[PDB]
Each structure stands twice: as structure tokens, then as C-alpha cells.
Design a protein around this ligand. Structure first.
Ligand code: HEM
Ligand code: HEM
Ligand SMILES: [Ca+2]
Ligand SMILES: [Ca+2]
Ligand code: NA
Ligand code: NA
Lengths: 309, 309
């Protein structure tokens, strides 16, 4: 289906101003991901990360923002892929060239690139509402701490957070499917291994995880989806059913009575998952967006447009 | 004379790496100032401003820093010239091209551009110690408030602040000579007019100032040096002797017994002023600098070099 459109946004927002905008972003992503498969996961996560930190307003792309491109102090689980930040900037440049001006916002680029990353990885092609404006407000560590969901959080905590932000249980289970591709550093799940193992981890999976992260503090990464690491599909839900979810936030989806039925549904039908994904990710991608007068269209995603006004 | 060199810095720091660096900066400034005379004042003040806020480390050039290029909330007296930020970036780009790589730091560019701005405005040609590194730390409003001297401050307060930062009374009187060029917004001196006029302002000058700023809150600017607004010379000291200094920080230099003799000396001999300027501005330009491992060489002055390390 198609996601509900928030006030101010619309599909084909650039139809008149820059009709080929979406094609340019896709063509760039296709080539970029071909050269670096992990870029797809990076871009997809970047969109998610940004959306939760203050809203889908490209705030985390700013150098002045916590977890932004110049961040070197944050732990592995809070540091985004450098190539993801770079890709967005490159796309922005290419778009300015194509549109004969800075018409497309970095916020929209994030939404489009994420969609294309999914498509390029074998996922569903869904429509993306456009018209978001870029924020001139930097994200503080406080913003990150209060709005960004952590991997150690259970479904109860996540439903509360997402509830405040306008997403329901279905959205939670659905957007969590983003973990069907990508990597995770030991630090993000080592607490499920030490001191004592999480009883929800299947014995076989535990042995595997202990090999990857022999002790707390191990500097190593592993795949989020043990079955198909780089293919966007429903295998992530099958992992959960088999007690092979990496994070507590992953596995608890199968443990919790409220989310369990949805997990089982998606595990049984990839089509059910794909159809719902475009809707739920569409809703996530419209959280607290800046419209028209609320933001600007950056000439460089890393910085706010210079000038007194 | 030549200013004392701080540990880590040296004249001709780029002699081997990029010998023509200094020539490129001058040539750019000469042309840029020709097109926009006010740019000289902008660059000169930018160097001063940056040096006091945390140290001569180009921190204020960062978009993430208070009073930086993206600042739109600060009052007129705390907003630097947009063209000054732009010029520095342009110089940095030209230098990367010339040096065949990002060799020269933005911090050094600030020091050189300031020197060239003085020279182009008819001032003395002095040697500049080089080798400063760019900071990865953003300046907070707190940093600005505690280290940046305000126009309402008297000599007693200024000597205390500068004393902590390694500058003496001579340095104060000398670097204050920077006000021999440039502009100031009514907000920076309106407190000397309303509610009751500052008795140190000569009657004639007061009438003039009241015309420029009829009431508190007037959005208008005036020249810092009523005699030669755009020429770098000792006329600023002559203004002080005639009770025609714009700021309290200006006029009090003549009022205070400690600084008065130096003001009178410079008013009588421009040569005495010019010779001392290169030394004092040299000292100011080396306050709390980052050397070798302490910073980086930005590929873009507005942002910290992206990456985990
Ligand atoms: C709301 C629950 C979520 C939590 C708690 C969460 C947490 C995390 C964490 C901690 C990492 C691993 C970082 C590391 O150790 O390197 C990660 C990676 C990832 N997440 Fe999520 N995530 C969630 C939702 C999402 C959503 C909505 C998407 C987007 C559809 C998404 C896409 C990804 C991707 C693709 C990666 C891999 C990134 C890469 O390989 O660079 N996540 N997530
Ligand atoms: C330490 C005492 C100083 C104080 C309190 C001070 C204060 C200020 C203030 C408030 C302005 C006016 C801003 C406005 O209203 O638009 C200004 C402008 C200026 N200052 Fe200073 N200043 C000082 C030292 C310096 C130094 C060391 C230099 C450099 C040699 C300098 C160079 C300038 C220049 C050229 C301008 C004009 C800038 C322009 O036209 O854009 N100042 N200063
Ligand atoms: Ca997969
Ligand atoms: Ca003058
Ligand atoms: Na954001
Ligand atoms: Na500074």
C-alpha cells in the first residue's frame, strides 16, 4: 500500500521544479551500492537514526550535531558509516547540478536514498512523500539519549517511545525488518552474552556469538541477519522465530505477546512484510518533519546555510 | 620588530611544503579587498575574535561554533561579516590547489589574511609565525562570554583579561589600534548615549553619535575611526586624544593612567605604532594555539574533517 501523507508533504513534490530528482538519486545509489554493498545498510540506518533524533530533518548530517559526520567520541553503536554521510553529500551535489539549483533538501535525499537502498537490496519499491525541509538546529547528546531507541530496550519500552512518536506495534515490527541487512558491533549485544547469557538466545547461536565476541570489549562486527546478511527480505523474522535475533530489541519482538503474531505473519509471507514495509517506513520517514517555512534547503548537508538570514 | 615565537610555531613553516603559500594569500586579499574595502576590517576582526574565543585555532570558523558562519541569533555586535567567513574558505581552496593538498591550516590563513588586510589598508608589513593547527572543538556561548572582551569594558577589566591570556598594557593599547578601520553597530555603544551620555564623549562627537543612533535599538552602523575610516594608521589614537573613541574600551585607554602614555605616544608617532603593532598582534595571534598533534588541517574551514579518526 501507500503510506499516509503528512500535512505539507506530497508525492511528486518536485514534479514541476525537478521531475528527474528521484531518478538521479536511484541511479547514484545503484552504482554506489554496487561498489560498496554495505552502503545500502548505512543509508537505510542513517535515515532511521536521523528520523528518531529530533525528526526527519537531516539534523544528524550536520557536523555540529551529536553522532554527526565529525563525531569521533561516540561508542561504535552510535557512530554512523562515514560513507553514508559522504554518499548523501555526493547525491546532493549531483541533484544541484541536475535541478540547476539547490532544490531538493538533504532530508528528502535521506528518504529517497533509503528507499533506493531497499530496492537495490532486493526489497519492495514503495512511494516516498517529499517536501521535508532541513533543520538549522543541531542535535545534542540529550536529544539522542531521549529519542533514539537502544538495542537493549524491550518491546514494552519501544512501544512506549514509538507510541509518543506516532508509530504502533505493527510499525515497530515492520521497521525493525531493516535489520534484514547490515552489521552490528559486539558492543551492541555483548550484554546479552556477559556476564550471563540471555536465555532467549538459542544454544547454537550463543556459541556462534561467543566466538565473535569472546569477551566484553571485543572490537569486531557481525551480521544482523545470519541467514541473508545483504539481501532485503523477511529472513530477519525467520531469525527471530529461531531465537536468532541479535539485539534484545530484535528477539523480544518474538517474545512479546503483542508483537509475536506480526513476527510470525511476516516470517510466513514475505509479501505481507514488503507491502506493509512501504507504509510503516513511510510513517517513520515523516516523524516531526519541517515544512515550508520551518527549515531550509542546504547547499551542503554538513552545514547550515551561512548568512544572517 | 618581530614578535616572539611560541613553541611549535615558526616563520617560514611552509618553506619546504608550500613556499608560495603566503604569496597566494596576499594576492587573494589584495584583489578581494579592492572589490570590497570592508573585507579588510572583517578579516582583521575575525582573526581577533577567533583568537580570544578558545585560542587562535579557527574554532569560530566552524558552523557548529557560537558566533560561527551559521549564527543568526546573536546580536549585531557578535555577528561577524559573512564575507569574512567566505573569504577564508576561498583562500583555503586556492591554497589546496597551490600546495597540491590541504597543507595550510585555516588558523594560519586567519593570521596571514589579517596581516595582508593591514598591509593592503596602508599598514605595516610584519612577519607572521605559522604552524597553528585547527581545532576540532566547537566554541560554546559560554566560551564567548568568558574570553571575548566587550566594548563596555574599561581598561581595568581588559588588563585583567589580557593579563590572564599573556598580553600586557602595551599589547592592549596596540592591538586596539585595529579600530583604525571598520564599522560598529549602534548596539555596541548606545549605552554610552542612553539613558545619560558618557561624560568622556566630547560634546561635538556626542551630537554626531545621537544623529546616528537617535534612540536605543537603532539599526545603523558608523565608523570606528571618524578621521580615516578605511586607512590603517594612527588616527585612531588621535581620535582618543580628542575624546572621540567609539567604545568605552576605546576611550578609557586615554582615560586610564596606565594606558594613557602609550596612547599619546602612538598619537604622536605612527612609526612607533606600526613597529609595535607587528609585535603585539603577533603575540595575540599565538594565544592558546594548537600545535602538531593538537589539531588538524581542515579540508573545509566550516567543518571538522569527517571520519572516526
Ligand atoms: C527501533 C529499534 C531499533 C533499534 C533499537 C536499532 C538499533 C540499531 C543498532 C544498535 C545498530 C548497530 C550499530 C552497531 O553496533 O554498529 C543498528 C544497525 C542497523 N539498523 Fe537498526 N535499530 C532499530 C531500528 C531500525 C530501523 C527502523 C531501521 C531502518 C529500516 C534500521 C536499520 C538498521 C541497519 C540497516 C543497520 C545496519 C547499519 C550498518 O550496517 O551500517 N534500524 N540498529
Ligand atoms: C580587546 C578589545 C576589543 C574590543 C572590546 C573590541 C570590540 C569590538 C566590537 C564590539 C566591534 C563592533 C561590532 C559591531 O557592532 O558591529 C569591533 C569591531 C572591530 N574590531 Fe574590535 N575590539 C577589540 C579588539 C580588537 C582587535 C585586537 C582587533 C584586531 C586588530 C580588532 C579589530 C576590529 C575591527 C577591524 C572591527 C571592525 C569590523 C568590521 O568592520 O566588520 N578589535 N570590535
Ligand atoms: Ca536478509
Ligand atoms: Ca584609520
Ligand atoms: Na533528525
Ligand atoms: Na578560536
Amino acid at each position: 500500500a501507500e503510506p499516509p501523507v503528512a500535512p505539507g508533504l506530497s508525492f511528486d513534490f518536485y514534479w514541476q521544479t525537478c521531475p528527474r530528482a528521484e531518478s538521479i538519486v536511484r541511479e547514484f545509489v545503484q552504482e554506489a551500492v554496487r561498489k560498496d554493498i554495505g552502503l545500502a545498510a548505512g543509508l537505510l540506518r542513517l535515515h532511521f537514526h536521523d528520523c528518531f533524533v529530533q525528526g526527519c530533518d537531516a539534523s544528524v548530517l550536520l557536523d555540529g550535531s551529536a553522532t554527526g559526520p565529525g563525531e569521533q567520541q561516540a561508542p561504535p553503536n552510535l557512530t554512523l558509516r562515514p560513507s553514508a554521510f559522504k554518499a548523501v553529500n555526493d547525491i546532493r551535489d549531483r541533484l544541484e547540478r541536475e535541478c540547476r539549483g539547490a532544490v531538493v533538501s538533504c532530508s528528502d535525499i535521506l528518504a529517497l536514498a533509503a528507499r533506493d537502498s531497499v530496492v537495490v537490496s532486493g526489497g519492495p519499491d514503495y512511494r516516498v512523500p517529499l517536501g521535508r525541509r532541513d533543520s538549522r538546529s543541531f542535535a545534542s547528546t540529550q536529544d539522542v539519549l531521549s529519542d533514539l531507541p537502544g538495542p537493549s530496550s524491550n518491546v514494552q519500552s519501544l512501544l512506549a517511545l514509538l507510541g509518543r512518536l506516532g508509530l504502533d506495534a505493527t510499525d515497530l515490527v515492520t521497521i525493525s525488518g531493516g535489520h534484514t541487512i547490515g552489521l552490528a558491533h559486539c558492543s551492541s549485544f555483548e550484554d546479552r552474552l556477559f556476564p550471563r547469557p540471555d536465555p532467549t538466545i538459542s544454544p547454537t547461536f550463543l556459541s556462534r556469538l561467543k566466538r565473535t565476541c569472546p569477551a566484553k570489549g571485543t572490537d569486531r562486527r557481525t551480521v544482523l541477519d545470519v541467514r541473508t546478511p545483504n539481501v532485503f527480505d523477511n529472513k530477519y523474522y525467520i531469525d527471530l522465530v529461531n531465537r536468532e535475533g541479535l539485539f534484545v530489541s530484535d528477539q523480544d519482538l518474538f517474545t512479546n505477546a503483542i508483537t509475536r503474531p506480526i513476527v510470525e505473519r511476516f516470517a510466513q509471507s514475505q509479501q505481507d512484510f514488503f507491502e506493509q514495509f512501504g507504509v510503516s517506513i513511510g510513517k517513520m520517514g515523516q516523524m516531526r518533519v519541517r515544512t515550508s517555512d520551518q527549515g531550509e534547503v542546504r547547499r551542503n548537508c554538513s552545514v547550515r546555510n551561512p548568512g544572517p538570514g
